[PDB]
Amino acid sequence: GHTGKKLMAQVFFGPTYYQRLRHMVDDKIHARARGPVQVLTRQPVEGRSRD
Amino acid sequence: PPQVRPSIAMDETTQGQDDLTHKLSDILKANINVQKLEMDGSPQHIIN
Amino acid sequence: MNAPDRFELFILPDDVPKLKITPDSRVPNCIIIKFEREDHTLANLLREELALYPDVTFVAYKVEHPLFANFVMRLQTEEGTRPKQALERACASIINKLKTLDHKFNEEWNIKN
RNA sequence: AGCAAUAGGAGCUU
């Protein structure tokens, strides 16, 4: 695509049935600088949803 | 201290004590029941 | 949520120049050009045009990262010639070739009717 | 300027 030159090797090419799995990066990316702590231990809470 | 056994909030107005707190309350009940036997009749099968 | 905008490929900011020239001091009479907001389309055209001149000794380009829309080009020339003048010469030559190509395509299309 | 706990279940990567 960059140069239009033929590729020296031939490429296995055709349609294939692919699936969209439920694991998205935007449902997993999490960062925490400072946030809520636990009442008992005063340590960072557990959970992406809980920060 | 209550730090070791803090209470918590379930739905915005309700609180249950930690296990250690209820255990200490049960111990206090037991203690007072002990102090209700050496003050009156106690036919030796309630003291034990 | 981290995806940049699809129009930053082509819209030039006001604080970002289109073109920036720095010299390569290691070899004589060589310059490094960074083209912002361009891609292989201009780069390959210019590279293969410049590579066929007698006075051009080195010419190359790369796109260091596909997620960023720029390329950098190294161009060296002989003692008398300046790489900048050769760059304008190549640009003008490709422009003239495209004009001739357009004229011939239009005449051919009219004849095909 | 303050967003509960405990459990069970289903999953992710080794």
Side-chain angles (χ1 to χ4, degrees):
Chain A
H2 305 344
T3 55
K5 187 164 170 181
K6 304 200 181 185
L7 295 172
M8 185 64 72
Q10 293 79 64
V11 177
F12 187 69
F13 196 45
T16 304
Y17 201 72
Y18 265 68
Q19 306 159 119
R20 171 87 152 125
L21 303 185
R22 54 188 300 166
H23 311 276
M24 289 179 183
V25 55
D26 273 348
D27 295 338
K28 293 164 191 299
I29 174 172
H30 186 211
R32 181 210 159 103
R34 290 187 187 105
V37 311
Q38 285 215 320
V39 165
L40 182 52
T41 50
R42 287 201 199 178
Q43 288 171 354
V45 301
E46 166 179 3
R48 161 197 164 72
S49 62
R50 289 311 221 195
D51 192 25
Chain B
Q3 280 85 342
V4 188
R5 46 196 178 87
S7 75
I8 57 171
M10 64 184 73
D11 55 346
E12 283 88 6
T13 52
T14 306
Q15 66 184 0
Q17 309 308 280
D18 197 89
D19 288 272
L20 295 184
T21 292
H22 291 269
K23 202 59 206 178
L24 287 177
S25 276
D26 274 354
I27 296 171
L28 270 166
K29 271 75 174 178
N31 219 46
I32 291 170
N33 299 352
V34 178
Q35 286 177 329
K36 293 301 211 311
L37 297 197
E38 65 196 39
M39 287 215 68
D40 61 6
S42 46
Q44 185 53 229
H45 312 97
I46 322 294
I47 297 192
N48 224 27
Chain C
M1 176 179 72
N2 278 284
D5 276 280
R6 283 297 291 289
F7 60 68
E8 294 293 328
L9 296 172
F10 47 94
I11 282 151
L12 189 70
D14 55 18
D15 53 310
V16 170
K18 159 63 53 162
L19 198 160
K20 74 168 261 193
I21 294 182
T22 77
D24 204 2
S25 55
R26 296 176 318 181
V27 299
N29 190 359
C30 194
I31 61 165
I32 313 284
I33 306 144
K34 269 180 52 59
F35 291 79
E36 192 46 289
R37 275 180 40 275
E38 292 295 18
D39 57 338
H40 299 284
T41 286
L42 177 72
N44 203 42
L45 182 70
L46 277 171
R47 184 207 51 76
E48 195 161 5
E49 182 62 24
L50 279 165
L52 300 189
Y53 290 19
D55 47 291
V56 162
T57 300
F58 190 92
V59 57
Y61 87 90
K62 56 187 179 184
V63 298
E64 276 171 299
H65 211 293
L67 293 182
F68 304 97
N70 47 350
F71 70 91
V72 61
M73 152 170 293
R74 186 182 205 250
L75 174 84
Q76 194 190 11
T77 52
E78 296 173 357
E79 292 56 70
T81 187
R82 307 167 48 218
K84 182 213 184 296
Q85 53 184 200
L87 191 51
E88 297 146 90
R89 204 190 313 121
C91 289
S93 285
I94 309 164
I95 286 183
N96 266 276
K97 297 193 205 186
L98 281 172
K99 293 182 183 293
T100 302
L101 192 68
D102 195 4
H103 183 70
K104 290 181 181 331
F105 175 80
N106 285 113
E107 58 174 343
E108 197 70 12
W109 182 270
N110 301 320
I111 295 166
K112 184 67 105 168
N113 166 271

